[PDB]
Design a binder for this molecule. Structure first.
Ligand SMILES: Nc1ccn([C@@H]2O[C@H](COP(=O)(O)OP(=O)(O)O)[C@@H](O)[C@H]2O)c(=O)n1
Ligand SMILES: Nc1ccn([C@@H]2O[C@H](COP(=O)(O)OP(=O)(O)O)[C@@H](O)[C@H]2O)c(=O)n1
Lengths: 245, 241
């Protein structure tokens, strides 16, 4: 069972032009993700999928593997489907190019889940959040059954707090593991109404009846979208280098 | 494939004591539901499951069949499980005793769905509602997939309207059809966190991984919970003559 990690890294970004190239403790952001991806046991290769030559050059400059993809891609999943035809594997893991604080152990949990159940098509991550955080539409909530299979993903607070003290919220962490066959049949899937309404691409899979198992992990580090969080990542990243002395 | 209709009708109610016996244009509410249930093709028997002797006698008075059940049940679903042991069938349809405006056609759609797919454990109904109506916590929303299987039931407006013009809403209509095996295993199912938070008993089934197919019908008539709704139903059933 061969598994590879693909890191989609688009340059073009509105509030952060050239986001993967931003410096964090002397290295571009994309490098931090790549270095951490390399620490994941059981992975054969790590690739960076991009549509911009400046990102491809930055990646090659530190010796990483880069693959140019079409710029007409509407999402990180469509970009992964194109990489799938060229890079062979049984399990593809999609890592965000803008989350430099990813824990290698969490990706291993995801990979072990896939290997422990050959019938599982897709696997993703989640962590507990408070009711106050769950109120934000920018945060994606998920509700699961006893087998930890996702029932639904939403920007609306789910479950609804009728009996508030009984509610427990789970935040969806955008890291995915796909079986090869799911990606091969992906482009044939039509867009769903819930997907278009919520603007959550993962609902396209749920519409087609494709099961998505969600594994729970500890609260993850802050991502990078706002320059307010960027400074916290830099200080948090630097604080980490001094701790491991 | 024997199918039976069970109408849970306890005497008590916080807002309308003795609800099943309330008069609606000459007949107690329970009789209206029972008579409409009798118009459903493909059903072998119709039973009223009750906890009170006054309800039982009223049903027998008009010629219907009634069965006494325990008074300690918390839901009509639990009451149905007790009946399943006494009345043998392959498919059990659970009708609300306080929804006298039920269309026999809608119950037939539900029954046909169960018969068209032997693997289907549970089936229920739903109908389109506006975005304004979906915002109400008292209205239960449901989201389905291409095969019309429910993904989740919630009091929250789902799907979330990020792109408002793309969102389409469905309201869950509390009528259910259960395969016998589901009812035999019901008492073993643990309550779920989502069930307790939302206060929706059907989430106990989803938690256990039991599939629930949702069939779409036209907007339904109002139920009778408050004395205000009772006056509206009386008016609606009067002009319907
Ligand atoms: N059309 C797109 C959109 C996102 N992506 C990538 O997929 C991940 C998730 O994107 P995102 O939610 O942070 O939104 P943006 O990165 O586009 O600002 C990032 O690594 C993106 O660069 C992509 O490769 N192609
Ligand atoms: N403990 C209970 C609660 C409801 N029910 C029945 O289930 C149906 C719907 O009840 P409901 O929960 O929606 O509202 P209530 O009738 O309980 O006030 C009615 O026909 C009730 O008589 C029951 O048989 N036993």
């Amino acid at each position: 069972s061969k598994a590879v990690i693909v890191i989609p890294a688009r340059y073009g970004s509105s509030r952060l032009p050239g986001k993967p190239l931003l410096d964090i403790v002397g290295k571009p952001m994309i490098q931090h993700v790549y270095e951490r991806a390399l620490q994941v046991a059981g992975v054969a290769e790590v690739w960076v999928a991009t549509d911009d030559p400046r990102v491809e050059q930055a990646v090659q400059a530190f010796g990483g593997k880069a693959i140019m993809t079409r710029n007409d891609h509407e999402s990180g999943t469509d970009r992964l489907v194109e990489v799938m035809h060229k890079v062979e594997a049984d399990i593809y893991i999609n890592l965000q190019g803008d989350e430099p604080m990813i824990r290698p152990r969490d990706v291993e949990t995801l990979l072990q889940g896939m290997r422990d159940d050959p019938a599982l098509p897709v696997a993703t991550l989640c962590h507990a959040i408070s009711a106050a955080e769950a109120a934000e539409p920018s945060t994606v909530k998920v509700v699961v059954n006893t087998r930890q299979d996702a029932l639904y993903f939403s920007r609306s607070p789910i479950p609804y707090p009728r009996n508030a003290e009984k509610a427990r919220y789970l935040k969806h962490v955008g890291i995915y593991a796909y079986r090869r066959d799911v990606l091969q049949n992906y482009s044939q899937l039509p867009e769903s109404m819930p997907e278009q309404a919520e603007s959550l691409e993962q609902l396209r899979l749920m519409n087609a009846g494709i099961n998505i198992r969600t594994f729970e992990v500890a609260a993850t580090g802050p991502g990078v979208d706002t320059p307010a969080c960027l400074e916290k990542v830099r200080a948090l990243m630097a604080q980490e280098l001094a701790e491991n002395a």
